[PDB]
Amino acid sequence: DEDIIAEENIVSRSEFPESWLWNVEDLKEPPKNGISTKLMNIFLKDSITTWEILAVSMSDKKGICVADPFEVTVMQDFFIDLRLPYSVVRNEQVEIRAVLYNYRQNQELKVRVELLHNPAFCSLATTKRRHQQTVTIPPKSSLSVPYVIVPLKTGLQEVEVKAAVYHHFISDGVRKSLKVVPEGIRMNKTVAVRTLDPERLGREGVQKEDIPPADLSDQVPDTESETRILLQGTPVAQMTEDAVDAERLKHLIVTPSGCGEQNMIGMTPTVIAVHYLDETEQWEKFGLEKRQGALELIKKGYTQQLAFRQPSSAFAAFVKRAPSTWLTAYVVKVFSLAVNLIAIDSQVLCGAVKWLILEKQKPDGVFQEDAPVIHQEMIGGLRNNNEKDMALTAFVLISLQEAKDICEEQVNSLPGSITKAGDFLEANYMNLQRSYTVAIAGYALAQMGRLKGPLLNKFLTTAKDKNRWEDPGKQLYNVEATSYALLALLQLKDFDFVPPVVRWLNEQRYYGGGYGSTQATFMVFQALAQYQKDAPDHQELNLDVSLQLPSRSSKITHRIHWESASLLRSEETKENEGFTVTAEGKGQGTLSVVTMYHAKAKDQLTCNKFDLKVTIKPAPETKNTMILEICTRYRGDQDATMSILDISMMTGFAPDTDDLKQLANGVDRYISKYELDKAFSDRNTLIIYLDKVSHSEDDCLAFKVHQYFNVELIQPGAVKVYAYYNLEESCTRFYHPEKEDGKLNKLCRDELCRCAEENCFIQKDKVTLEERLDKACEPGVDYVYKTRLVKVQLSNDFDEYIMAIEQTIKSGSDEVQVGQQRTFISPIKCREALKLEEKKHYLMWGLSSDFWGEKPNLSYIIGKDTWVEHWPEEDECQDEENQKQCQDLGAFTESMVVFGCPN
């Protein structure tokens, strides 16, 4: 038209990001008034809204700082607000609103508003027909323009509406996108739940695993399928069963007091309690400033203990008594372990060691006792008279081995007193019934690196149930023998047999102290203290899992380590394939397989919460008028509270103001004054507010609609119901005078749908020979047949016309041979103008875009570019009128058969 901007010259607004300006800028120019200043030139985006700009600044000296948000409002006097949903289902008709605004103060605007045509969408906008309304928007006000469209192609898709205003150089357009999606929904599912633990039925040949694929035979076509693995690390890793509680050892801090042996009885639980708490870092809970007072009980025990130091560097009960062999060795063990805690004298420790090697050793190296203690309960399992030259050789030796890191050059022939003592016990290691003498000798051996073979086996197998070195009778000797053994197992670096031994000690909870517990205390809290040191810091969880997918070219040998704080991964498959998943060595972990697909629908999509029924019919006696009737009820025998009916007019129709006010005055029904006070022509959307609706009956209402503007085609109307508290669970029906279910003419079967709003076949005056030969050679034309209609088969959705092929004037992609049959397809509404009759012959040609089907699901669509035309019978041709035609067909067939198209 004249005096308005043309659609082609309008460039639609497009840039509508939710966030932008993700930029960095350094302030460089000099500080006037101690404040730098940068001028930034930004390009505002297309969104008509208010932006909020947030600046955070970082400085070396003044640090971090966060500005107050700064608003910017972008605005126009006239614009379109295209209200698109987040997504829409494919082949599902939907209505969208374009809202036009006129913020001019004293001036109506006459606008032409237009929906552009997009192949992805079936609408009244078509290839050769625009869809344009003309509306008048009052000042300081807006106007809804509805558009019914059916998305046909999946994925991210685009809608464009534009608008020019007459009599002004003013235009607008909005180009937004929406996600078109299939049906179904998302399904998590696991295939395997394994445990990657070698040396536990994974065996010596490093656990080799196999995990087959997913089934996925109920799947809906043309979607993704992402597998997801969960490679966990459920950790008892750091093989460290929780240490003994710190609150239980409160009775161990004993103030040492007595003679020469009673002083060493009291000093035992205190010194070992410190050695324990030092490594386990449990000084927080027990009492931190108590260590400075508990160290002074050991310094009090040490300073008192040197008062019983005889001239020859030896120890005993009193100074008057002859010296004991074992007691001087135990003093070296407690002093060697307490070198780190208190100030020991150099003359004292190695001095007690010099006396032992020179004075107390026999030909073969049995450190025999010379003065048995009065308090014999202190020496523990040695108190038993059975084999007290085998254990007694090992005990004194252990004191030498722990004190060897310090005493080297002073005690000259120390290497030698260790080798010969290690001969006597090693040789006679196979002559020990009791588990005590087996174990106490076993720790002495392992410190040197001489515990191998049958002597290393007898050590392992003496343990009853593979954990504890028990003996018949008193159970304090049982706990002592095993703790010596745990010190042996820690030195060997055999982390296979370590866990079961300590696990039993944790289920004993022997807190020491009491009476006759000297050795059971010193050894259990030393062995479980040395355990926290040498027990693996990071253990392992060392699986080399190599996943080989036959879709993929290469393996993916994923490493696993207890160190990375994740312990989880995930791949992303594209095709459902069977793959190997081979583990390797140590640790533990989960191993799931979760694909994700879309299934078929099941018949309860649509209107889950409401029933909606809408009809439009002609009026009674009295230009064009009709009776819209809306019938709705909720779902569940329990009236819904407060609902909305959002109605939209068929183009050119408007509601009867009289019938509306009649409705609004009715109880349980409300229509805003704003809607009622509006003009007749400027009112094509409507909201009727209901107070309730149940599933007892059906709540029904109806009202007159009058056609004021006259137009061709005319877009269906729409009624949408929902409760106020939930828009998402809605239900919409459409209405139209000549379509019912106001559905736009589409052509659906199986997956996809053709927009069928176009003309049925190529229309019709001349039908020249020179006409047919042009249009039969138009670009797309991929076939021209002579066909006999074998069997006509009708339906409501689409009529299946079966054609027999007489001759193939032109062959194309479909390699049909003469005599064979091909199925032609046409919508419900084309049958009227087609008149396809059985055993009547036909001349048909059409495009490659008309092939619906895979192969041999081949069908022929009789679309707008398809040409069909009647061919009188061979003997029927001989007749006055229709001789003109019959000849031109045969004349056309020979031009086509002989010369074909010039292309």
Binding site: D77, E108, K110, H167, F169
Partner: protein
């Protein structure tokens, strides 16, 4: 087609009143607005005022506020300028133009204009012109017409009902010491065209109903 037409211009006594009208056609009056601009003899354009026909909203140049007024009949797509307390310095040609809104935020250009009407604010009396032949003096022969002693402006001279437009020169009027205007309209024609062609000059003076068609030819003597 969009087109605008002013009318009602003429002579007024100082202090007096006058109502110009502007006939809009070819567009919806209600969706647009109309401006009155004026031009003093041989000087710049001065915008006078808007009207928004939709709801009758006005704006006025200070030079006119309290004196001038714009109204509209929306059914007859006409706008009106009612002038009161007219001064000497209000003498001008008065145009009406359509305001079209190009930008955003209410900027407008004026894309269609009427032809304008001349309003002249003087004590003087309406006087019709005396029209005299300017005879050609026996290859190109000039002839013309003298339009003498008239007031106020304007006069419109044309030749043979506007058939002859080629090489005509209707000169500016000139204010005689008497107070009345006189101008010449001259037209050069090929001297051969005399005798055969007829030459009538078509003076028309709206303010005094004076219409004259004078023939101009050589003499007998």
């Amino acid at each position: 087609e969009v087109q605008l037409v002013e009318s009602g211009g003429g002579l007024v006594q100082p202090g007096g009143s006058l109502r110009l009208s502007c006939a809009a056609s070819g567009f919806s009056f209600t969706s647009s607005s109309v401006s009155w601009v004026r031009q003093a003899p041989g000087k710049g354009l001065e915008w006078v005022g808007l009207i928004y026909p939709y709801n009758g909203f006005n704006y006025y140049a200070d030079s006119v506020k309290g004196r001038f007024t714009i109204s509209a009949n929306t059914s007859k797509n006409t706008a009106y300028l009612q002038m009161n307390s007219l001064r000497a310095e209000d003498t001008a040609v008065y145009y009406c133009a359509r305001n079209a809104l190009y930008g955003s935020g209410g900027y407008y250009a004026m894309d269609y204009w009427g032809q304008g009407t001349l309003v002249t604010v003087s004590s003087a009396s309406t006087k019709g012109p005396s029209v005299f032949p300017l005879a050609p003096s026996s290859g190109t022969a000039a002839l013309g017409c003298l339009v003498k002693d008239y007031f106020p402006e304007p006069v419109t001279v044309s030749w043979n009902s506007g058939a002859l437009t080629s090489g005509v020169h209707t000169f500016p009027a000139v204010l005689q010491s008497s107070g009345l205007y006189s101008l010449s309209s001259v037209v050069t024609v090929p001297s051969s065209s005399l005798g055969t062609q007829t030459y009538i000059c078509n003076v028309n003076h709206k303010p005094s109903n004076t219409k004259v068609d004078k023939k101009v030819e050589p003499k007998s003597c």
